[PDB]
Amino acid sequence: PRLEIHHRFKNFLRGHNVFKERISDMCKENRESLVVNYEDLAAREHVLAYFLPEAPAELLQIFDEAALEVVLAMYPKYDRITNHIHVRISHLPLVEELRSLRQLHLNQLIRTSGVVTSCTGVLPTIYQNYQRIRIQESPGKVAAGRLPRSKDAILLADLVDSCKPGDEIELTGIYHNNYDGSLNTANGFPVFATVILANHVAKKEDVKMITSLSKDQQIGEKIFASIAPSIYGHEDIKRGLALALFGGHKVRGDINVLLCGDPGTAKSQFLKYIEKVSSRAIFTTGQGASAVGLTAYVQRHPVSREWTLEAGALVLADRGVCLIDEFDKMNDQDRTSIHEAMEQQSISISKAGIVTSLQARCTVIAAANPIGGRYDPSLTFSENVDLTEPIISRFDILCVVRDTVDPVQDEMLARFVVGSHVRHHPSNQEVLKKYIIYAKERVHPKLNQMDQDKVAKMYSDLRKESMATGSIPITVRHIESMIRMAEAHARIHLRDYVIEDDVNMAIRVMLESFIDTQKFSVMRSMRKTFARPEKDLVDKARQINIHNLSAFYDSELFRM
Amino acid sequence: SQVSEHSIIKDFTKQKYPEHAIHKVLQLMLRRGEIQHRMQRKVLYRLK
Amino acid sequence: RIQETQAELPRGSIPRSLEVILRAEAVESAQAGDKCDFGVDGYETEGIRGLRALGVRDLSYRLVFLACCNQMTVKEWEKVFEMSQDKNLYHNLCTSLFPTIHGNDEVKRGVLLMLFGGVPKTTGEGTSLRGDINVCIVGDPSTAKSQFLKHVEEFSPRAVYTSGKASSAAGLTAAVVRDEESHEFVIEAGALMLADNGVCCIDEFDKMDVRDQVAIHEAMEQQTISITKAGVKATLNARTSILAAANPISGHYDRSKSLKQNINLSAPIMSRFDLFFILVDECNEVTDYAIARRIVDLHSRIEESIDRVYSLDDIRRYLLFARQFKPKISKESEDFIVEQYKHLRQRDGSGVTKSSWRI
């Protein structure tokens, strides 16, 4: 439209102290970074600053040509660094937090955010120029309940191998609908019908007011007497929920919370209420879940289409929490693939020829569904299973239901339903939600060297007691979960001791487990407890209370 | 019938046989001039 | 591709498929399977080569238009008010809807109530309160199937004439539409959703062995369908009641044998069903003789003609609009049943003849 700026800027192709050092920042080391502030762009040439929201498109062609001019003139040796320069303009105010999800605003620079999920190095000439990646934008929220339009980005061999999972980065660009499928020989994009190019990937308050109330002990007393107000459930469930809420080097762990009811009762739907508090909850329902249900599958593809890299919700909740529903209703075929990944929460190959890692570090929360009746058959529960041992043995705790016919307890739930229906009919608190969630990020206590033995001493005594009358009938693996469970206790109170009130409650956990595995004759042998060579080497470590097996001459490990 | 091409692949996976096997046998028995290969040549030439 | 209204269509229909183009106004605003309710110079003459007909045969052969998105009432209502003065009105009202049924009063009793609806909306952004009724009836051993009573319900609007399940069933099994020119299978779940805002009668419910077993479970619980084939993904709304009848594989044998493994159906689906029914025949010669007579009676129209006083369907639809009016039911009447409900849960364990333990 105008003429004064176009020719001058085209002839350009024919606070600055930071720029002076930043232009030389790239070197043979190949740090592969380019950080440019947007405010400097308006500062150096102000005529462009007004043209940025009008005609940003021509800048893309100019930027690639302009970069070579300066570099080639200085030192031709630097030419062999990635053989590419990427435009990395910073943000351009405006900012759409929720209204950006519109197809009406095409041909405009768009500011957004996203996370790199996976890389396609492990996968095998027109189609070879580009690859396929699975990207989401909408996070888990109550308002985000309506299903959004998923993004499918295309890598044109530029950001391959340079992207790593876990980068909370921001995406900026223009959505041109340059639909390359005009030859009608491929598939197509969802409702947001536009080809999405990648231009920005980084490489290297009410919180305070609530935090003031967090340390307060006045609210710290009633907090564990309001944890489960929806149905009041059972005392064991609240413990599992509280542990799941906190979700707590190789300092990792997994929690297996078990429920014993039936699907018809909302007990099966009790896990639905977690998404109100949880940040990342996806319902699988079993077979035919939403896109990829954490399981990898292969389909037959036409002549020219891309094989699918399966991105589970496991990747999307890195250092997060992932919720799984109806775990036992999944297909037998899916079990075979998922059995190996669950063991290591990743894919690890140590052949020294092919190496890769895919992160999956959410807290696996799933509920088992009893097959048919609870204990109607008269045969053994454990000894009458044709299934494979290692998959079943993923459950740390096997809780059994207590009491069968309690009308008084059942009486309360019915009135809750009746009262609930009253409120919904016409008639003419985020402060508490974030209290527990925020705590798990700030509390990181330290350990005392002279008291580390005493902590581990107590539990070791309980193990050797069970070896008097028996033949190795207790496994350390069950204990292995118990030690991490006590961890949240110190994270909550930071009182340096454990009260005897909590001790009685944790006892009820173990007694339920013995009920299910042992025949009902447990009423005769275990009365007193109830009424009142690689693996061998692991037991040896507990006698000295040293986890590290390479603690001898650790001074030479630091040198390496 | 009922053992068509879209389901025979999954049977190998059910037998703990990955996609490597299907090329070695399934993709090679039809090139042998099997009746099943000729069945697709005549019945499914336009019916698909 | 809008399809013409089947209800307005006659028995011999041959529907005509409209081909209309819908703009963004149609995006996430329409439901799959429901009714649409919103001078020259230099002597440049002809004779220059370059004329081709490839661009004429494609669009011209199709349909090219654009579209963009008192006393009579009282008269029916008067019967409800005036008839109240007659004693035992409720008893006669039950018979009134089933002129062509003999016996099986308990069977129609559940169906009769199934008509009444009432689904609460979501205003506090909470959970969806379920307002439909899902009843399954156990009947014949699949010989002269007493599901034939289903045919009576057909004489009513807002219903789907389900062809059981053993059918091609292109709907509800949506598939990719873009095999580089076109595909026969489309993205459409009309197989069930067609009765949205209505009542659905599903026949041959025992044929859900593999394909439907996964399908119906998702539909029943969530009231929506999550179709996903890597090119399409969306959720819909399938709000309707499910009327179905189930028969055993080869006969009724659980009278003497326990239901464990004997009924041989899928528990997680039948578990979600609200009610069940049993059809016991009795040696009542008064009704056994009269079962067929009431059937043949429609052949004796020579000496008897039945006058039409009111439509048995129009009166029902008067209650439909009553839903927008507010009942303002007090809590006093409501909780009284709830208090008695405590007695109901205990008395189920009183040792009466058992049929199916549900609680």
Tell me if C276 sits within 8 A of C138, measured CB to CB: yes
CA distances from C301 to C101, C296, C297, C304, C306 (A): 18, 10, 8, 5, 9
CB-CB under 8 Å, A184 with C180: yes
Q: Report whether A344 contacts A254 (CB < 8 A).
A: no
C-alpha span between A6 and A383 (Å, rounded): 82
CB contact under 8 A, B14 and A332: yes
CA distances from residue A59 to A67, A194, C304 in whole angstroms, order as listed: 12, 21, 90
Per the CB < 8 A criterion, the answer to whether A156 and A130 are in contact is: yes
Contact C275, C135 (CB under 8 A): yes
CB C315 within 8 A of CB C75: no
Cβ-defined contact of A300 to B14 (cutoff 8 Å): no
Contacts of C130 (CB under 8 A, 6+ apart): C119, C223
The three-state secondary structure class of C161 is strand
DSSP state of C66: B
Residues in chain C: 359
CA distance C8 to C22: 24
Other CB atoms closer than 10 Å to residue C342's CB: what's the count? 14
Q: How far is the C-alpha of A109 from the C-alpha of A115, rounded, in Å?
A: 19
C231/A421 CB distance under 8 A: no
Burial of C136 (0-12, 13-18, 19+ CB in 10 A): buried
Query: How far is residue A313's CA from residue A363's CA, in Å, rounded to a whole number?
Result: 12
- Residue A186 contacts residue A304 (beta carbons within 8 Å): yes
**CA neighbor of A395 nearest in space, from A233, A509, A275:** A509
- By Cβ distance, the residue of A188, A290, A410 closest to C231 is A188
Say whether residue B20 is in contact with chain A using an 8 A CB cutoff: no
Touching partners of B (3+ C-beta pairs < 8 Å):
A
Q: Are A395 and A256 in contact (CB under 8 A)?
A: yes
Distance CA A152, CA C231 (A): 11
Q: Three-state SS for A20?
A: helix
The secondary structure element, H or E, covering residue C172 is none
Nearest CA in chain A to C177: A187
Report the C-alpha gap between C197 and C159 in whole angstroms.
Answer: 10
Residue A406 Cα to chain centre, angstroms: 39
> Looking at this protein, which amino acid is placed at residue C144?
A
Contact partners for chain C, using 3 or more CB pairs closer than 8 A, are A
Beta bridge partners of C138: C246
Is residue A322 classed as helix, strand or coil in its secondary structure? strand
Question: What is the nearest CA distance from A333 to chain B, expressed in angstroms?
Answer: 6
Query: Is A414 within 8 Å of C178 when comparing Cβ atoms?
Result: no
**A298 → closest Cβ in B14, B16, B19:** B19
Which secondary structure element, helix H or strand E, spans residue A66, and what is its range?
helix A57-74
Dihedral in degrees, nearest 10, Cα atoms B2, B5, B8, B12: 180
Q: How far is CA C154 from CA C102, C134, C144, C191, C202, in A?
A: 17, 17, 19, 17, 11
The backbone torsions φ and ψ at residue C152, rounded to the nearest 5 degrees and listed phi first, read -60, -45
Structure-token pair, residue A97:
């937090």
Tell whether C226 lies on the interface with A, counting CB pairs under 8 A.
Answer: yes
Choosing among B4, B13, B17, B19, which should be mutated to test the A contact, i.e. which has the most A CBs within 10 A?
B13
For A170, list phi and psi in degrees, rounded to 5: -115, 140
Q: In what order do the strands lie in the sheet with C199-202?
A: C134-138, C241-246, C199-202
**CB proximity C127 to A under 8 Å:** yes
Question: Closest Cα to residue B10, out of A331, A123, A303, A311?
Answer: A331
Q: Give dist(CA A13, CA A66) in Å, integer.
A: 6
Please, are residues C156 and C312 in contact by the beta-carbon 8 Å criterion? no
B8 chain-A contacts, CB cut-off 8 A:
none
Give the residue numbers of the binding site of A for ADP. 268-269
Q: Rounded to an integer, what distance in angstroms lies between the CA atom of residue A519 and that of residue A160?
A: 57
- Experimental method for this entry? cryo-EM
By C-alpha distance, which of A196, A147, B34 is closest to C228? A147
> What's the CA gap between A244 and A277, in Å, rounded?
11
Neighbours of C355 (CB within 10 A): 13
Residues contacting C123, CB < 8 A, separation 6+: A424, A426
Would the CB atoms of A272 and C127 count as touching at under 8 Å? yes
Please name which of A37, A86, A39, A45 lies closest in space to residue A66, comparing C-alpha atoms.
A86
Give helix C314-322 / helix C71-82 axis angle, nearest 10°: 100
Beta carbons within 8 Å of A435's beta carbon, 6+ residues apart: A210, A213, A214, A223
Q: For residue A281, what are the CA distances in angstroms to A139, A144, A326?
A: 10, 12, 13
* Resolution as reported, in Å: 4.3
Q: In a 10 Å sphere around its CB, with 0-12 CB exposed, 13-18 middle and 19+ buried, how is residue C266 labelled? A: middle
- Cβ contact (<8 Å) for A332 and B6? no
Query: Which chains are adjacent to chain A, needing at least 3 Cβ pairs under 8 Å?
Result: B, C
β-bridge mates for residue C161, sequence order: C201
- Cα–chain-centroid distance for residue A500? 35
Is C130 touching A (CB cutoff 8 A)? Answer: no
Task: Determine whether the interchain pair A150/C233 forms a contact, defined as Cβ–Cβ distance below 8 Å.
Answer: yes
**Terminal C-alpha separation, chain C:** 47
Instruction: Look at strands C241-246 and C134-138 and give their pairing.
Output: parallel
